[PDB]
């Protein structure tokens, strides 16, 4: 997250870290045994880390649980990035408390202008490299489909949305993929891609979760 602020310990209880010997992607807890992330975060040997704040130091509220299944959307296209969503089943159910909780799926899509909260342990610099120890947060608005398409001609599908600021300086970045975009207490997006990070006229692109609600519910129930 570039241009954000320190969230505060366990203030985003649905945020998880996907670890393969190091943090490589984020995710969101949707129930005691399931996490939603980006399809491009698929890797073998994933360990899901819940209740994290400082990802480099054991603080006492963590739960480390291995993934038992990773289900990538059957229509994920690795070239166009369309349908960039994946579901991860935990080998054992997590213990839900105040520091570890699920986030609700949306009942309807969010419109341009809605303010959302984006979080992650990704790079905090637009030029250069600086990975934080603690979770970073950013408040950013959802942008109109028109503006999103003008920023990325011929690359935006109906399953994506842009969020951020056209002046740049505030955005999600490498290490934030798979993480949540929460608006009015509902999970509306997943950190996906963009042209660099925090660049002028190039806001971040996110997977539009509202289009996958039925798929998510049925898939979780049949696995």
């Amino acid at each position: 997250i570039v241009g954000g602020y320190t969230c505060g310990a366990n203030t985003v209880p649905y945020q998880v870290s996907l670890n393969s010997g190091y943090h490589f992607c984020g995710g969101s807890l949707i129930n005691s045994q399931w996490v939603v992330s980006a399809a491009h975060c698929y890797k073998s040997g994933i360990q899901v880390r819940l209740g994290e704040d400082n990802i480099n130091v054991v603080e006492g509220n963590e739960q480390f649980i291995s993934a038992s299944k990773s289900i990538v959307h059957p229509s994920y296209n690795s070239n166009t990035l369309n349908n960039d969503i994946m579901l991860i089943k935990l080998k054992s159910a997590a213990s839900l408390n105040s520091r570890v909780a699920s986030i609700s799926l949306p009942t309807s899509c969010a419109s341009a202008g809605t303010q959302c909260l984006i979080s992650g342990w990704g790079n905090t610099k637009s030029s250069g490299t600086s990975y934080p120890d603690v979770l970073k947060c950013l408040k950013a608005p959802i942008l109109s489909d028109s503006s999103c398409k003008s920023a990325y001609p011929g690359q935006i599908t109906s399953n994506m949305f842009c969020a951020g600021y056209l002046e740049g300086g505030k955005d999600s970045c490498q290490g934030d993929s798979g993480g949540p975009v929460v608006c009015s207490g509902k999970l509306q997006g997943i950190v996906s891609w963009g042209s660099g990070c925090a660049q002028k006229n190039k806001p971040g692109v996110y997977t539009k979760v509202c289009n996958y609600v039925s798929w998510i519910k049925q898939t979780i129930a049949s696995n």
């Binding site: 491009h40 993929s177 891609w193």
Partner: protein
């Protein structure tokens, strides 16, 4: 020895932080870099051994 072994590492537009290897012709060895998770170019390997086997000596 291939030409792709001489190309600079490509992170790509996706926002993961996946550690991969690339052949660095200037230093004559395989080095690590951050890959974003999509649209990989060919000078991108999952291990130093794969990188050295494919690009070693370029």
């Amino acid at each position: 020895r291939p030409d792709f072994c001489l190309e600079p590492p490509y992170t790509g537009p996706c926002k993961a932080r996946i550690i991969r290897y690339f052949y660095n012709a200037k230093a004559g060895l395989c080095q690590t870099f951050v890959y974003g998770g999509c649209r990989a170019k060919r000078n991108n390997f999952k291990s130093a051994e794969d990188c050295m086997r494919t690009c070693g000596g370029a």
